[PDB]
Structures are given as structure tokens and as C-alpha cells.
Design an enzyme around this catalytic site. Structure first.
Site, PDB file in Angstrom:
ATOM      1  N   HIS A   1       0.700  -1.183   0.067  1.00  0.00           N
ATOM      2  CA  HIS A   1       0.077  -0.023  -0.051  1.00  0.00           C
ATOM      3  C   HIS A   1       0.826   1.299  -0.180  1.00  0.00           C
ATOM      4  O   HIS A   1       0.468   2.153  -0.547  1.00  0.00           O
ATOM      5  CB  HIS A   1      -0.886  -0.023   1.384  1.00  0.00           C
ATOM      6  CG  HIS A   1      -1.901   1.354   1.224  1.00  0.00           C
ATOM      7  ND1 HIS A   1      -2.937   1.115   0.350  1.00  0.00           N
ATOM      8  CD2 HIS A   1      -1.870   2.397   1.968  1.00  0.00           C
ATOM      9  CE1 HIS A   1      -3.854   2.139   0.555  1.00  0.00           C
ATOM     10  NE2 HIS A   1      -3.080   2.809   1.728  1.00  0.00           N
TER      11      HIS A   1
ATOM     12  N   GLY B   1      -1.129   5.063  10.933  1.00  0.00           N
ATOM     13  CA  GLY B   1       0.329   5.054  10.883  1.00  0.00           C
ATOM     14  C   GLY B   1       0.889   3.623  11.362  1.00  0.00           C
ATOM     15  O   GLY B   1       1.968   3.487  11.244  1.00  0.00           O
TER      16      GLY B   1
ATOM     17  N   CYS C   1       0.197   0.753   9.823  1.00  0.00           N
ATOM     18  CA  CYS C   1       0.521  -0.114   8.521  1.00  0.00           C
ATOM     19  C   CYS C   1       2.061  -0.705   8.711  1.00  0.00           C
ATOM     20  O   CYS C   1       3.065  -0.038   8.983  1.00  0.00           O
ATOM     21  CB  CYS C   1       0.288   0.428   7.440  1.00  0.00           C
ATOM     22  SG  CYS C   1      -1.481   0.537   6.933  1.00  0.00           S
TER      23      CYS C   1
HETATM   24  C1  LIG Z   1      -1.424  -0.450   5.384  1.00  0.00           C
HETATM   25  O1  LIG Z   1      -0.632  -1.260   5.207  1.00  0.00           O
HETATM   26  C2  LIG Z   1      -2.794  -0.291   4.669  1.00  0.00           C
HETATM   27  C3  LIG Z   1      -2.953  -1.132   3.554  1.00  0.00           C
HETATM   28  C4  LIG Z   1      -4.059  -0.994   2.829  1.00  0.00           C
HETATM   29  C5  LIG Z   1      -4.792   0.016   3.148  1.00  0.00           C
HETATM   30  C6  LIG Z   1      -6.260   0.333   2.268  1.00  0.00           C
HETATM   31  C7  LIG Z   1      -6.748   1.456   2.585  1.00  0.00           C
HETATM   32  C8  LIG Z   1      -6.531   2.433   3.703  1.00  0.00           C
HETATM   33  C9  LIG Z   1      -5.373   2.176   4.397  1.00  0.00           C
HETATM   34  C10 LIG Z   1      -4.535   0.978   4.203  1.00  0.00           C
HETATM   35  N1  LIG Z   1      -3.585   0.992   4.970  1.00  0.00           N
END
Ligand SMILES: *C(=O)c1ccc2ccccc2n1
Ligand SMILES: *C(=O)c1ccc2ccccc2n1
Lengths: 295, 295
Positions: free
Chosen positions: B41, B137, B139
Site C-alpha cells: 500500500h 500509521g 501499517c
Molecule cells: C497499510 O498497510 C494499509 C494497507 C491498505 C490500506 C487500504 C486502505 C486504507 C489504508 C490502508 N493501509
């Protein structure tokens, strides 16, 4: 979203844990700069001044991972021993020794033979015990909080009491509560529920979308505290109202509005429902803990 | 004594966390040897093959603490990006990439801007979500277990679903469950309670002196599973009976003896009592988790 019992990352403390052996007793120690701190029980109603005068530096075997550290001095501070070693720990973080108050929380790095085994979050109970998870060999495990880069050490583990709860000292070797580091009939006294933390956790629930316990009513601080006394809750102070300000403003729910919900929950129970995955009112999260997780 | 939600010490994973930025998007990455793993992403129903072909190495800013790492190659594996860097991480632990099963537990190191913020324990739910605690934040935060010296990475965080639960991938970039890494109407499906873990936790309670729910009765596996179906519990298998062997032997309580207690608890509730500090039946501790803490 979500709300978990969350500990601080333990790496800065892991790099300080060592094994201390004297005689046939082995426990954990904390290596900061050129000093190792550990429970004085490692030298075992004895007089510990007498016991320590009979020791010399060579009686203490300190092992940091695979390296043996040479002890060059020894002294006692209250219920902790201080072993001066010939090498400063290169992994020493910025640190402070800070005694905590009942109702505050800290992370515990449970350790055996100088090797960290797990990390969990604890609150200091009003009766000065902690509901820890410790087995034989855990003496000298430490509790801490972290702010920016600085580790504030607040707890060193010593004892298990008859009910299975735990007692220990600050890093100055002063016990929390009326406990001693030997086998007596000592027992935890009556405990109470930490009201400000329950309210903080109800705010965490609102932030996370749990709203079923809310109502249109408000109460007075005086009428709330009359109900708190009946259910073994601590009285709410204005200072506690003040510290709940940020959470009250984020949710738009006045502190005395939330107090009316808590009063209703104590009188009526949950009626088969849950809040943040619990079927009881949780009191081991401070307002700061909630703000940190529910930013 | 005592029983806590206990995570693995996080230090070995803390030394692997970095920040990855592409464009205006920043998230967390995992630096092992000379590769940084992060959610794809970071380069954002797009075709990610197209999006990645349009990037070059210089579009990726990787920061390890204060040091910028030079990206020398980039590729995609399923929902993860692999950024080859010119420096092997000197803090790389022994590690494996291991996909976990529903019902198993792991520790989560929640991270923001490459900086670890907290550690907590999670179970993979039967519906392939986790009940995490993550803010914007987070992710790229990872889940893991540790065995001896070896970190088994099992989870990388991607998504929050509408109910506030979380979805992510293994370290090969394959999602747990029927989820995708983009905004759709996707939602968690119906979940179930992890029966073997509830039984393990009842054994933990017995080991810790909670015995009020025990009874003289035993049941058959067949009659138990008829009750499990009614309360949305998974069926108990003989393999699960087998894995509860060690706990059954330590307590002297046959697995089918404990099943009769669980049946009674489901039918009658707790009658105002608690088990290990909970007013509900807890299903996020595996038999191994119990043995580790109740040795
Ligand atoms: C974080 O890795 C991530 C992946 C996919 C995504 C889709 C939509 C919003 C936020 C996101 N964060
Ligand atoms: C551990 O530090 C410690 C201190 C005191 C003590 C007394 C009796 C039994 C075990 C103990 N451990």
C-alpha cells in the site's frame, strides 16, 4: 481502534538483565552503568548487615549473557544489593528511578536466570500489591515505564503473598506497602477499586464505539461519592475530574455525566452485555493509558 | 502464581523496525538481512504491477533510526513489497516466516513512523481477523512468536475492518482470510469461540487455585460437542484432547471432566463470580500459553 492491555516495548530493559548467583541462590539483576541492582535475598529474621559483612566480592557471580562480570564492590541499600562491576553496560538506556503511586500502571519484564521470558502490564493496587504472573526464579524482575527514550524503573520483584498476589520494592529497595523480604504471616490488606481508572476505561469504550451504558443524566460529585463508598470504590476528587478533562472533551461527555453511567452500572450490573470485551468494570488503565491508545 | 495476557519480549523485533516512505505515504517496515518488507500500500482497484513498474529505487526512502538506507532493488510478493538495501541489518535475529492457524496466539509490536510504541498479545480468530489496537500509521506493524532465540514472524498489519477488528497478511504477503488491501465493503464474517483455549484457561484457573466451577461429573465428547454447537463453540477433537494431556495430568482433572464444567458454565453462567479475574470465558490463551505461564 481496539483497546488492549499494552506494555511498553521491552528492548531497552532486556539489554540490562543479568543473572546474579551467591551460594546456591540465583536470581535476576539489573545492570545500569557499572552497577548491578538485585534483591538482597540473594545472600540468604536474619540481620542483613551481618550477612553482608560476611561476604566478599568473589562470592557474587554475575553473568551477562555469556560474559562473566567482575564484581569490584558491594553494598546494600534497603532491600536491594548494589554490586559494582568493572564494566559499564554499553546498552544502558537513559533512565530514572521513580516510585509510583497506587492506581498507576507499569510494564513488567518477567525474567528467569537473567533471561527475559515475557512482558505484561500491571497496576499498583491501592493495597500496594500487584497482580503479577511470576514463578520461582523471577526475583529481581523489574517494572518500568518509558517516556520518549527514558526508562523510569519503578518496581523490583521480591515476594508472593498467600493470595497469589505480589509484593516488591522500588529501585531504592523500599517496599511498596507494609511487607518485608522474609517468610512471615504477612498478607495483603483489603483492596479498593480505582474509580478514576474505571471512568477512563469507560471513555476508552465510548471512543471505540461502545455506548450502550450512556444515559442523559448527570450527577453531583457528592452524590457519586456516596455510591462509590457503598461499592468499595475510591472517592473521586476534583484533581481526578481535571485529569479526565482531555477525554471528556474528545467525547463530549462531561465527567459527571460519565459518573452517572458508572453509578447505574454499579447498581444494575451489565444485564448480560460487555464493554471493550469485558463483563466487569476494569480499573487497571489510567487516563494516560487511554489517551496513549485512543489518540 | 497469577495469570496475565503476556507478550514475548519485543527487543529482537524492535531492532528490525524501520520507516518506509514513498510519495506522501509513510508506514512501517521490517529490516532483516539486506531486505526491508512492508505493505505494498505504500506505493498507492489499482493494478499494483502497473504501480510498481512506474517506481524506481530512489522513490523509496527507508530510515532506520537516524540512518537512511539506500534501496538497491524492489519487488512485490503478493501484498508485501521487498526493498533490497545496501546494508544487512546487524541486529537481525534468527528468524522464520511462519503462517499461523486460527486459534493460535502471537505478540504484536505496534509501531508508528518506524518507532515501536507498545506490545500486546493477540489471537487469530476463527474468522481470520485479530482484535488488535492500531491507529493511523500502524501499517506494517508485525506479529511474532519467539522460540529459544528464533523469531517466527506470522503477521504484518494492513487493514481495519468496519467493526474495528483488524486484517493483515503473513510475511509472504498472503492475507489471512478473505480480505484485500483496498477500501471495499468487505466485513468480518461470523466468528466462533475457541473451545480448546477456553478449556486450557480453565486449567490455568485450577492451577492458580480457582476451583469453584469444578464438579464431580464427566461427559462424553459427543454430548459435549452437542452443547458446543448450541453456544457457538468449536467442536472438540481428539487431537485437542491430546494436546490438553499435560494440563490434565498436572491438575488430575480429566479433559472430559473439565468439559462437564464448561457445559455447566455455558448453561448457567457464572452467578456473579469470576475466574482468573474475568467474568466471561476467555478463549485467547492456547494450551502452550498456559503451560508456559503455569509451569
Ligand atoms: C497499510 O498497510 C494499509 C494497507 C491498505 C490500506 C487500504 C486502505 C486504507 C489504508 C490502508 N493501509
Ligand atoms: C526474591 O527476591 C525473594 C526475596 C525474598 C524472599 C523471601 C522468601 C522466599 C523467597 C524470596 N525471594
Amino acid at each position: 481502534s481496539g483497546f488492549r492491555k499494552m506494555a511498553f516495548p521491552s528492548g531497552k530493559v532486556e539489554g540490562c538483565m543479568v543473572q546474579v548467583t551467591c551460594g546456591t541462590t540465583t536470581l535476576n539483576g539489573l545492570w545500569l552503568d557499572d552497577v548491578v541492582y538485585c534483591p538482597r535475598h540473594v545472600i540468604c529474621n536474619p540481620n542483613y548487615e551481618d550477612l553482608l559483612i560476611r561476604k566478599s566480592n568473589h562470592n557474587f557471580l554475575v553473568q551477562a549473557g555469556n560474559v562473566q562480570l567482575r564484581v569490584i564492590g558491594h553494598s546494600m541499600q534497603n532491600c536491594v544489593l548494589k554490586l559494582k562491576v568493572d564494566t559499564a553496560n554499553p546498552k544502558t538506556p537513559k533512565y530514572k528511578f521513580v516510585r509510583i503511586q497506587p492506581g498507576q500502571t507499569f510494564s513488567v519484564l518477567a525474567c528467569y536466570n537473567g533471561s527475559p521470558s515475557g512482558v505484561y502490564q500491571c497496576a499498583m493496587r491501592p493495597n500496594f500489591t500487584i497482580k503479577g504472573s511470576f514463578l520461582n526464579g523471577s526475583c529481581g524482575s523489574v517494572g518500568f515505564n518509558i517516556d520518549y527514550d527514558c526508562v523510569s524503573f519503578c518496581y523490583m520483584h521480591h515476594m508472593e503473598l498467600p493470595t497469589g498476589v505480589h509484593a516488591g520494592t522500588d529501585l531504592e529497595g523500599n517496599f511498596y506497602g507494609p511487607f518485608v523480604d522474609r517468610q512471615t504471616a504477612q498478607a495483603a490488606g483489603t483492596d479498593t477499586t480505582i474509580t478514576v481508572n474505571v471512568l477512563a476505561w469507560l471513555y476508552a469504550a465510548v471512543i471505540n464505539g461502545d455506548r450502550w451504558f450512556l444515559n442523559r443524566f448527570t450527577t453531583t460529585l457528592n452524590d457519586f461519592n456516596l455510591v462509590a463508598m457503598k461499592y468499595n470504590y475510591e472517592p473521586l476528587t476534583q484533581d481526578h475530574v481535571d485529569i479526565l478533562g482531555p477525554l471528556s472533551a474528545q467525547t463530549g461527555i462531561a465527567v459527571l455525566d460519565m459518573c452517572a453511567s458508572l453509578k447505574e452500572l454499579l447498581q444494575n450490573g451489565m444485564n448480560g452485555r460487555t464493554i471493550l470485551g469485558s463483563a466487569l468494570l476494569e480499573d487497571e488503565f489510567t487516563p494516560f493509558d487511554v489517551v496513549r491508545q485512543c489518540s
